[PDB]
Symmetry: C2
Subunit: 93 residues, 2 copies
């Protein structure tokens, strides 16, 4: 019915797929977040200008693989990827 309801339900579903693997079901570690972004958003690539920002963002996740990531931070990461890879934000400050 409503597109946004299914979309948000889907981002929770993906979080559950990775966070539910083992341990604390409400958390991911940075390694898992990196894996999730690489596998679940595999076709998303940086726009002509946010290439640097993107490369860094993804690289940074590797510096502390065990670091905890909660749901809000996971969703924020998705948002950042939109700013880096979605054409709508190409001109966004």
């Amino acid at each position: 019915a409503r597109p946004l309801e299914q979309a948000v339900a889907a981002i929770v579903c993906t979080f559950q797929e990775y966070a539910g693997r083992c341990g604390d079901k409400y958390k991911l570690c940075q390694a898992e977040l990196k894996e999730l972004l690489q596998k679940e958003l595999a076709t998303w690539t940086p726009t002509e200008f946010r290439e640097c920002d993107y490369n860094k963002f993804m690289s940074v996740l590797d510096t502390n693989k065990d670091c905890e990531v909660d749901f809000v931070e996971y969703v924020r990461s998705l948002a950042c990827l939109c700013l880096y890879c979605h054409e709508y934000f190409k001109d966004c400050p």
Copy 2:
């Protein structure tokens, strides 16, 4: 298409729909954010022990109707709604 890519692209779609109405295409005011949430996620309701949190969240948007939020802030609001209305987080601290 990958489920998460479709989901995130839809989240951007909705934002663009509301933010593109008039003014700064990269911003919404909290009044419009509340409008978006009540219309796009109309069937989403707080879980058993998050009614108070949810009520405060919704009341805060009214108190700050004219404040603006960018895309990241908008996505953050969606994350918060998951914490309040999605069963997966029912017992999340």
